[PDB]
Ligand binder design. Sequence first.
Ligand code: ATP
Ligand code: CL
Ligand code: MG
Length: 318
Amino acid sequence: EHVDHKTIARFAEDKVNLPKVKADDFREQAKRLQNKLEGYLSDHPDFSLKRMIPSGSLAKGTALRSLNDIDVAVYISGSDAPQDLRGLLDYLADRLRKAFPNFSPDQVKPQTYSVTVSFRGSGLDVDIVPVLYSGLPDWRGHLISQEDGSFLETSIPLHLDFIKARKRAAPKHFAQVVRLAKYWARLMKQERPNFRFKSFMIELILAKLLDNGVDFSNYPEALQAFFSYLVSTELRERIVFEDNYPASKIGTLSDLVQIIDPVNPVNNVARLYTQSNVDAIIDAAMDAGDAIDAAFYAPTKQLTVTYWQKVFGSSFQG
Ligand SMILES: Nc1ncnc2c1ncn2[C@@H]1O[C@H](COP(=O)(O)OP(=O)(O)OP(=O)(O)O)[C@@H](O)[C@H]1O
Ligand SMILES: [Cl-]
Ligand SMILES: [Mg+2]
């Protein structure tokens, strides 16, 4: 009544989602870099940068209006490349300057776990993560973690297939609920001590709920299922998918939270989450779920909005 699914959908369109016109501009930005590398590699077959793949929320259709960087993975092959993290990022930056000679050298900047290509206002910065590639199936290779620089063997193409499958199972709605949950998590990171919640983990948890039959066409109910899953399981239930391997193949782990990469059964996406992190997520999810329930039963629109502002902050006006 006061706030229902349509209210939430309109809020998402108004405040949460990256507008389609901007998403298209940014994807065309990444495609121009992709095409420049493909043309350089066509002329120089020995060049060690073999492929650029858009890998982040823009590629998945889950970007927020707050997006300020475009994610691409660059696949690196050959003996020249150092295995050390610092050396590899310096090596990648040097190769990028050679393939993109029109850029001023200072427009390519190594960071802690990635290399930035800065466009200086004429487009967003592109954040390039290396993948050491040696020809494993499905363009598997060792991706650099943006949490701790660990080398993680995985497949970005298969992750994008994984997300595509859930978006086809629930068109519009899966991506929308992911975006709403990401928007909530951004607010909680500012408000709750020790709160951390990686976007890929939010997507995997929501993909499990969709797989399990949760109806994503009602956004208040889908969010309540997400928050209630976190409170009831306390993030102690292992999340694993059978898209690419059977449950017999999952390696046992001693990690507190286990949300297993759908490509690689020994790669736990949640490996760095501590009990402190978990407790902050659980308290935040309990509070959000409680706010949505109270909002449903609130007698006035003003009270209903106040409760939803506990979930989505002051930008939510009803
Ligand atoms: N722990 C991991 N193991 C394997 N691959 C990962 C891991 N974390 C991230 N990735 C890969 O990096 C991609 C980007 O995930 P990330 O959590 O950075 O979110 P995003 O979709 O870019 O959202 P945003 O940057 O808006 O928070 C994932 O889709 C996946 O391919
Ligand atoms: Cl992105
Ligand atoms: Mg990203």
